[PDB]
Amino acid sequence: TLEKFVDALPIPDTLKPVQQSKEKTYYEVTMEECTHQLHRDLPPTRLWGYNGLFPGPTIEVKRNENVYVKWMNNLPSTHFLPIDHTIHEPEVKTVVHLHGGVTPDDSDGYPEAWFSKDFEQTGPYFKREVYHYPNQQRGAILWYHDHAMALTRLNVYAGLVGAYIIHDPKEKRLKLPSDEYDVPLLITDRTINEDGSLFYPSAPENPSPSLPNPSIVPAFCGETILVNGKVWPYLEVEPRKYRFRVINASNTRTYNLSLDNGGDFIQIGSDGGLLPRSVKLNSFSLAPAERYDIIIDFTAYEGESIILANSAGCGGDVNPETDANIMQFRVTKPLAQKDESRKPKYLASYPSVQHERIQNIRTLKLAGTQDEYGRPVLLLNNKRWHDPVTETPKVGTTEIWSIINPTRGTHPIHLHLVSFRVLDRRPFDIARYQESGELSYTGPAVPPPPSEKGWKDTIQAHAGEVLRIAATFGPYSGRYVWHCHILEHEDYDMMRPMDITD
Ligand SMILES: CCn1/c(=N/N=c2/sc3cc(S(=O)(=O)O)ccc3n2CC)sc2cc(S(=O)(=O)O)ccc21
Ligand SMILES: [Cu+]
Ligand SMILES: [Cu+]
Ligand SMILES: [Cu+]
């Protein structure tokens, strides 16, 4: 196993515009196969990256900035990871989805709006080359990645992930740490071969003779953890307050972070932006696609080496010497100036201030069947991706979604376009529900903790519970999607279309 904490943390450069004016900002990003060293003792690794970078460059915009990004495919015609042709036409398809973006439907990166190299071939839902991001939403941590039909888990694992930040000039008065002291942290677990090449399972453990090859796997757990493209890195920090945009860009793995010196995290934001009130945390869970906007005060730890630790297991308990480690902070950098940043308690207006009428209430269940090969096929409400759309909210209206989870594992449920509030969680008799379809609660409703009292777009739906959320579908109408963000699940039909009707 690679030696931990020997490479410094890379800080992705901020992408510079091809053209910019007061009325518009135009960017160009090209997907390319490239090589990068992920660790001091590894040979270079072959990856796929936006502008040839892993992670891709960080994009910074202001609220309401009129942005355009021309995402281009200039990758090889053949993939380098195991493709299962039985779960679903050029071999390499790509489409960029701005996760968390309030985007017009033809710029949202629909799974079937893919395109091959140079846009030679395009999916049935392709409409445009240059994506449009009006950015008329709250300041927040967004991130972009590939979303191609049936290839999402592979393209993302290949390295197609990047951070996107929306800055709301009105929040500047909070004086939160900024600039050099505002650092994004993209966490991705990977398994790397001796030759430095990426390893992605070609099939499940002990493959059945009647199983396809390659064969998609229901989940993926890497043996190594990276942050911003480097294995267990270290970051030199000044003894003061820092802001971190934590992003889980992993296929399956869920993290449960904490600091080994017992220090606290100060959560100031969730997927949807600033929380109404800051929350002191000793630890926090972060499933795939979830984002935590936090402040860490290093002021009193000058000289110390602090480890960002993980206690959540993935396909087993955490290994103290490996996946139990994320990165290491080193409070040894001299202060460049006085720490003028603040860690205010009053961050933003409450979401509950809004009083919307409940137009509809959808009850959805997390299930699945089994294919001809004996493999599990996860389905949202027992429907397949290709079946006729069923989740059809009306633009401008608010609905309550009740997600029933009779499975034995947690599912990070994500809805495109919108941001939503969490109402509560409640346990139920799984056996009963599975045998009679009847839902019987075995305890009271549990309201969300301070962490989920803001706006979320990716939410954890625990096993044996019913999760209720509320969302106002808009401002745009069109064809979008909602799905589990565990890529291995998403690619084998745990994804459904979502039509916001007008
Ligand atoms: C319902 C799930 N579906 C499977 N894949 N899903 C997975 S893989 C997975 C890994 C983690 S981890 O870090 O994030 O360990 C957490 C949650 C996970 N889930 C969702 C629970 S495997 C299966 C077997 C049966 S049984 O009836 O074959 O005989 C029935 C249904 C099945
Ligand atoms: Cu996403
Ligand atoms: Cu899932
Ligand atoms: Cu998505």
UniProtKB/Swiss-Prot annotation:
Activity regulation info: Inhibited by azide.
Sequence ranges assigned to domain Plastocyanin-like in this UniProt record: 44-80, 93-170, 232-310, 370-501
Effect upon mutating residue 108 to T: 6-fold decrease in catalytic efficiency with ABTS as substrate. Almost loss of activity with 2,6-DMP as substrate
Reactions catalysed according to its record: 4 hydroquinone + O2 = 4 benzosemiquinone + 2 H2O; 2 (4Z,15Z)-bilirubin IXalpha + O2 = 2 biliverdin IXalpha + 2 H2O
Effect noted on mutating residue 108 to A: 5-fold decrease in catalytic efficiency with ABTS as substrate. 785-fold decrease in catalytic efficiency with 2,6-DMP as substrate
Temperature notes for this entry: Highly thermostable. Optimum temperature is 45 degrees Celsius for SGZ oxidation. Optimum temperature is 75 degrees Celsius with ABTS as substrate.
Subcellular localization, as worded in the UniProt entry: Spore coat
GO biological process: sporulation resulting in formation of a cellular spore
Binding, Cu cation 4: 411, 484, 489, 494
Residues annotated to bind Cu cation 3: 147, 416, 483
Note on cofactor: Binds 4 copper ions per subunit. The 4 copper centers adopt structures classified as type 1, type 2 and type 3.
EC class: oxidoreductase
The protein's name in its UniProt record: Laccase
Residues annotated as binding Cu cation 1: 97, 414
Function of the protein: Multicopper oxidase that catalyzes the oxidation of a variety of substrates, including phenolic and non-phenolic compounds. Substrates include syringaldazine (SGZ), 2,6-dimethoxyphenol (2,6-DMP) and the non-phenolic compound 2,2'-azino-bis(3-ethylbenzothiazoline-6-sulfonic acid) (ABTS). Has no tyrosinase activity. Is implicated in the biosynthesis of a brownish pigment that characterizes sporulating colonies of B.subtilis, and which appears to be a melanin-like product and to confer protection against UV light. In vitro, also shows strong bilirubin oxidase (BOD) activity, and can catalyze the oxidation of free bilirubin (UB), direct bilirubin (conjugated with glucuronic acid, DB) and ditaurobilirubin.
Site for Plays a crucial role in the protonation steps, residues: 108, 490
